[PDB]
Design a protein around this ligand. Structure first.
Ligand code: CU
Ligand code: CU
Ligand code: NI
Length: 312
């Protein structure tokens, strides 16, 4: 009893707010550990602000959910299979829901800008099912997310600073392989309030830092084998013009017969750190990406914790 039926996906909230429900179209996964995607055009063409997210997940069957904004979803039609292949243009992550790692709300006054001339025209929802119990009866699943949108401009604008490896090669059996990422920050100040890490099975630890005058300030560090939620930052951290952002993923090659490189499958790897930030509305940009390592030598003074795993 979650599929919306005759009422549809759009609930008016007041004069300038509405909830948009983004739901799987009554799907039934045949195999276990399945990744479904679907998209929705924004109903409004003009600029809007996403100011809250409420999960609508079947607590039996849903392992994780991700919601992106983009302009070109990978597929048209109802739903598709997406082993993390959501958009053809760049997919902007907005929200992660993981089982056993409950999400944290956006700070009040903070929203993502979407729609209009430059914002995302589509949402893409990815749902990872995992365990196919309770699907015995072959019931239709309508899991996803209810998104609160408003036309009211927000004083603070949420954005994403994505750090990702592109060139990493993990030789087979190799005990430790480091993937290092670094860029100089050249925008108005951002304040990091949440982070998410992502590797595949070879990832041991992922850490990100702001480097200012050789001083390393921790943004977040996580075991990527733990649920890949957005975790709150322990202390709010500003990144300002002249700062360097730095991240290290630690991988092992133990267990593999052949080299492992970066790519989109499970026998490939990724080193992704998603740094969620707010900015003053008049200075804000919605996304930044670092795919480089501009200060490789700086990593000589990376804190020792970046090399040590988290005790599970
Ligand atoms: Cu999952
Ligand atoms: Cu991946
Ligand atoms: Ni501050």
């Amino acid at each position: 009893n979650e599929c919306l039926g005759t009422i549809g996906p759009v609930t008016p909230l007041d004069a300038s707010d509405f909830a948009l429900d983004i739901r799987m179209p009554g799907v039934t996964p045949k195999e276990s550990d399945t990744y479904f995607c679907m998209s929705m055009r924004l109903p409004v063409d003009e600029e809007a602000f996403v100011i809250d997210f409420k999960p609508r997940a079947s607590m039996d069957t849903v392992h994780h959910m991700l919601l992106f904004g983009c302009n070109m979803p990978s597929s048209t039609g109802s739903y598709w299979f997406c082993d993390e292949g959501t958009c053809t243009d760049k997919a902007n992550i907005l929200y992660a829901w993981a089982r056993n790692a409950p999400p944290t709300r956006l700070p009040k006054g903070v929203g993502f800008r979407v729609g209009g001339e430059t914002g995302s025209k589509y949402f893409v929802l990815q749902v990872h099912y995992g365990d196919i119990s309770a699907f015995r009866d072959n019931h239709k699943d309508c899991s996803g997310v209810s998104v609160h949108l408003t036309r009211v401009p927000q004083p603070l604008i949420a954005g994403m600073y994505l750090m990702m490896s592109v060139d990493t090669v993990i030789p087979p059996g190799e005990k430790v392989v480091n993937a290092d990422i670094s860029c100089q920050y050249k925008m108005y100040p951002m304040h990091v309030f949440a982070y998410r890490v992502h590797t595949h099975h070879l990832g041991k630890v992922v850490s990100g830092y702001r480097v200012r005058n050789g001083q390393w300030t921790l943004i977040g560090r996580q075991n990527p084998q733990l649920p890949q939620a957005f975790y709150p930052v322990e202390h709010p951290v500003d990144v300002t013009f002249g700062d360097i952002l730095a991240a290290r993923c630690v991988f092992t090659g133990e267990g593999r017969t052949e080299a492992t490189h970066i790519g989109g499958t499970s026998s490939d790897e990724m080193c992704n750190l998603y740094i969620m930030y707010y900015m003053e509305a008049k200075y804000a940009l919605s996304f930044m990406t670092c795919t480089k390592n501009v200060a490789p030598d700086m990593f000589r003074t990376i804190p020792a914790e970046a090399n040590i795993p988290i005790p599970v």
